[PDB]
Design a protein around this ligand. Structure first.
Ligand SMILES: [Zn+2]
Length: 252
DNA sequence: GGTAGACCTGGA
DNA sequence: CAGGTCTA
């Protein structure tokens, strides 16, 4: 899921779990658990803790318990559901948090690609994977100034810059491509080649793109099809080791 | 400073 | 491959 989707998950999941106390934690694919290293320690520590909050950082969900925070990343196909312990688990369910009221928080992921880290709450923010995470794209902490500072100091393409989690939190392939189209900037442009005007425009479109979604695509996945703004066929190449979609007329 | 190995599997 | 974010 994308940042706006994760924000939706955060908003909807919270009332379904807040105030519930963990009685058990069941793990069917240990590799999802990244900290503590031992999935049995991960399970043991959460037992007895009550869910107090749910926050989001980039595409990470941060479950706040009594003493610990649980940091979760769904990647592209991970999903959470709250349901009765009395009903059969859905396919590809890898982690289940059982509450004292007979309900469960279930983590499902066909790709088995998601990750979970648990730390003492006061430590979460200075440990992986949240450590070094850039500012929220919708926050004043993410400004044209910050973006310009990173752009000038690098020799990478502008797309690689925006894909860097330390520059800005949770900006993935789709929104990078969409934002660059809307900014009129070729993805393969060196970041340092961007004028001050291009940086300002890019920041504005980044915020608008992500901001509108949290509340139709121009280029992503539309290769071979006419540009919605000029009718030129959208093209697809590889930039920063990724599938990259752009209009060779609208973007320069 | 980077780029790239690692993780996973359904469908090209 | 298609995805993202970590560790090497
Ligand atoms: Zn166009």
């Amino acid at each position: 899921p994308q940042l706006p989707e994760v924000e939706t998950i955060r908003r909807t999941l919270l009332p379904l779990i807040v105030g519930k106390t963990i009685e058990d934690v069941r793990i069917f694919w240990p590799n999802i658990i990244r900290h503590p290293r031992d999935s049995e320690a991960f399970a043991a520590r959460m037992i007895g803790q009550t869910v107090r909050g749910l926050e989001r950082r980039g595409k990470f969900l941060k479950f706040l318990l009594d003493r610990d925070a649980l940091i979760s990343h769904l990647r592209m196909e991970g999903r959470y559901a709250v349901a009765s312990a009395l009903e059969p688990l859905e396919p590809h369910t890898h982690v289940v948090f059982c509450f004292t009221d007979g309900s469960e928080l279930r983590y499902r992921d066909v790709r088995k690609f998601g990750t979970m880290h648990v730390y003492a709450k006061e430590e979460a923010d200075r440990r992986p994977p949240l450590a070094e995470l850039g500012p929220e794209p919708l926050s004043p902490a993410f400004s044209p100034a910050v973006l310009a500072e990173r752009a000038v100091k690098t020799k990478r393409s502008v797309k690689a810059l925006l894909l860097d989690c330390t520059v800005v939190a949770g900006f993935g392939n789709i929104y990078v491509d969409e934002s660059l189209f809307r900014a009129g900037i070729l993805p393969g442009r060196p970041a340092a080649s961007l004028s001050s005007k291009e940086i300002e425009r890019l920041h504005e479109e980044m915020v608008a793109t992500i901001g509108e979604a949290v509340m139709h695509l121009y280029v992503y996945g539309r290769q071979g099809n006419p540009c919605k703004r000029c009718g030129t066929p959208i093209e697809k190449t590889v930039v920063a080791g990724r599938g990259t979609h752009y209009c060779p007329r609208c973007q320069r």
